[PDB]
Design a protein around this ligand. Structure first.
Ligand SMILES: [Ca+2]
Ligand SMILES: [Ca+2]
Ligand SMILES: [Ca+2]
Ligand SMILES: [Ca+2]
Length: 294
């Protein structure tokens, strides 16, 4: 097989996996739209490509990247282009390689609003500058993503607001999990891209195992968490990047815990994650399987 394995993530930071596929070459121009139907069309996404690269010659290779936005490129486990930033780069790194030998390649990429593109070229004394071609790329095996916790959940209900104070609603729906890092983007193109917006998630968490749980909310820059109509985390005006947690709560398998999670961005970047720890559950995003909208 030819190409590299692309793992596509719904956030700017290589979190919240939505799709793996084999891409024949790294040569993408996405405009302001998503790379794939599985990735929310909100202008905040990221990709990791992994596999092997086979040069034809025993020569110093130059790798060229065109990027919007950030890229990191490792060849033979050496980071040769380290450009994980919000600029637009039209980037080089050099490395000596041996003819016919297979080398590791890893390329990480993000889009943080606006246009998204990434193109990988190479040259050497005997290699005319070109897109790195498919016949020189071999895809990695898929890495598994996703929780082992079973259950019939489908997500929480969401309401997206154009103001930072839970007003001017623009969209509603279901979010599979609460694991978001939009950078300076909004949760949907229906929400103006001004870094001042808010979200209400509602529904129920159905508990998988008898024992004690702690909920963690990591936010930029305000959040409040209601559990069974008790306000357990009151950080609405915290205007900071931080994490907060509940006390331990004894819960039973099958118990339905009513949840209301309020979130806001008031400027610059925005992110929010709902995690838990529990019996047999290391601190981790509360999974879709345990989230219900009603
Ligand atoms: Ca996104
Ligand atoms: Ca961009
Ligand atoms: Ca706004
Ligand atoms: Ca912020």
């Amino acid at each position: 097989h030819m190409g590299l394995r692309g793992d596509y993530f719904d956030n700017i930071d290589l979190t919240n996996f939505k799709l793996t596929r084999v891409d024949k070459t790294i040569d993408f121009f996405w405009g302001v739209n998503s790379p794939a139907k599985e990735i929310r069309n909100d202008e905040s996404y990221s990709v990791r490509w992994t596999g092997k690269i086979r040069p034809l010659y025993s020569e110093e290779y130059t790798f060229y990247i065109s990027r919007d936005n950030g890229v990191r490129l490792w060849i033979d486990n050496k980071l040769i282009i380290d450009k994980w930033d919000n600029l637009v780069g039209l980037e080089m790194g050099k490395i000596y390689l041996e003819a016919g030998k297979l080398y590791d390649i890893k390329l990480e990429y993000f889009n943080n609003t606006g246009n998204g593109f990434v193109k990988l070229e190479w040259s050497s004394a005997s290699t005319v500058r070109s897109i790195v071609p498919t016949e020189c790329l071999y895809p990695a095996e898929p890495k598994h993503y996703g929780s082992s916790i079973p259950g019939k959940g489908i997500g929480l209900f969401y309401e997206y607001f154009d103001e930072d104070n839970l007003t001017n609603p623009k969209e509603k729906g279901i979010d599979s999990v609460i694991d978001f890092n939009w950078g300076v983007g909004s949760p949907s193109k229906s929400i103006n891209q001004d870094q001042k917006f808010s979200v209400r998630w509602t529904g129920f968490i159905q508990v998988p195992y008898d024992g004690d749980y702690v909920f963690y909310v990591s936010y930029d820059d305000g959040a409040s968490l209601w559990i069974d109509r008790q306000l357990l985390i009151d950080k609405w005006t915290a205007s900071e990047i931080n994490t907060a947690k509940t006390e331990a709560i004894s819960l039973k398998a099958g118990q339905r815990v009513e949840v209301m999670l309020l979130y806001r961005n008031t400027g610059l970047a925005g992110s929010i994650r709902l995690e838990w720890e529990g019996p047999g559950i290391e601190r981790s995003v509360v999974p879709q399987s345990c989230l219900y909208p009603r």
